[PDB]
A = this chain, B = another copy of it.
Amino acid sequence: NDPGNMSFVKETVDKLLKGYDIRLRPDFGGPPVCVGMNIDIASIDMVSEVNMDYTLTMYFQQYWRDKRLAYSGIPLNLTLDNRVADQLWVPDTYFLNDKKSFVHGVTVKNRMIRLHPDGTVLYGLRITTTAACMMDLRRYPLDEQNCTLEIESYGYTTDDIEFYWRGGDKAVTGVERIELPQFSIVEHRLVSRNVVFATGAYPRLSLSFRLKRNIGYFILQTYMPSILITILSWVSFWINYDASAARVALGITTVLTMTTINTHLRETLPKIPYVKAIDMYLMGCFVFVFLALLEYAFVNYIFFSQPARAAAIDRWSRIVFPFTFSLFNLVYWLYYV
């Protein structure tokens, strides 16, 4: 009678669960139960190129109607303790491409159950998931990546369960609040479709993000040191050819430094078999510094016999090398921009 009478509410809930079979889906043997899904993305923790995965924390909500749970006489929505979910049928929703995921359990299990008079159930979970994402690093670090989150029913086919994004394109929220230091979220999309397997067709919901990497870090960390070393190798041109130790030391250090930069960066990334965009720039800078050392070797080889010709090579090297390196940067950056 009275909504505030807890004895009446307790009796109503007890009647719903009496004879309730968790082993059977709602409308078992009839039309498939439609499950609506919304995601409130709390944050994207990290994006790992080494492991080809990203970590996602979100509020995962499922919406479906179970006529066995319909109640009358209480004009209110019943928000029950989360432990009642273990006594109710829930969809066997799982993430297809996840690698490791869990539900937060402090202070209690991060779970909520809300009932409605018509029998509709609101089921929410706070989940941190690590989802695999294959990334094409050919244009790294100027690449754009597309990481998805595939949602599917594990055991029920389309004849038993159907999926849909509740709210259309507004089903997923919080994308604008995601703060990735290395990436920017250009766009997100929602896809609903059915996938055919050997046992039958299964419902599928896809949430995908298009990530564009920020180049500001790589300019300061990799590109600028490579340019400075290349400019450092040009100092040998203005050094007199009689300074054999000084000019060879300039050639050796720049060549060795360029190799260390190229090798050290590649160790951080996964052992991919192809060449990246940054690798092309690093290998190009290696050629310029290597030719600078070979330039003095040619000069040192003819400086005694032909001092006039050796001086000309040094004088022209002060112009060709800076100009060719500028040309190399022009074609390189225009291609990848």
Contacts and interface: CB of A to CB of B under 8 A. Distances in A.
Interface of A: 2-6, 9-10, 13, 19, 21-25, 27-30, 42-43, 45, 57, 60, 68, 76, 79-84, 89-96, 98-108, 110-114, 122, 124-129, 132, 134, 154-157, 160, 179, 181-182, 199, 214-217, 220-221, 225, 228-229, 232, 235, 238-240, 242-250, 252-253, 255-257, 259, 263, 266, 270-275, 279, 286, 290, 293-294, 297-298, 300-301, 304
Given A182-B271, A235-B293, A249-B245, A300 B240 contact: yes
A28 B6 contact: yes
Contacts of A273: 181-182, 214-217
A298 to B, nearest CB: 8
Given A81-B92, A239-B297, A256-B257, 17 more contacts: A6-B21, A6-B24, A10-B19, A22-B81, A23-B83, A102-B105, A112-B155, A181-B271, A217-B271, A220-B275, A232-B252, A235-B293, A240-B300, A244-B245, A246-B249, A248-B249, A252-B253
Main secondary structure of the interface of A (DSSP, over half): mixed
16 contacts: A4-B29, A13-B21, A13-B24, A23-B84, A57-B99, A79-B155, A106-B129, A181-B271, A181-B273, A182-B271, A229-B259, A235-B297, A239-B300, A239-B301, A240-B304, A247-B248
Nearest to A80: B23
Nearest to A301: B238
A108 B80 contact: no
A170 B216 CA distance: 45
Given A24-B81, A240-B244, A245-B246, A256 B255 contact: no
Identical chains in the assembly: 5
Nearest to A20: B10
Contacts of A243: 244-245, 248, 300
A28 B113 CA distance: 15
Contact of A245 (B22, B104, B221, B245): B245
A107 B102 CA distance: 8
Contacts of A57: 99
Contacts of A182: 271, 273
Nearest to A215: B273
Nearest to A95: B106
Nearest to A46: B51
A126 B99 contact: no
B259 A225 contact: yes
A29 B6 contact: yes
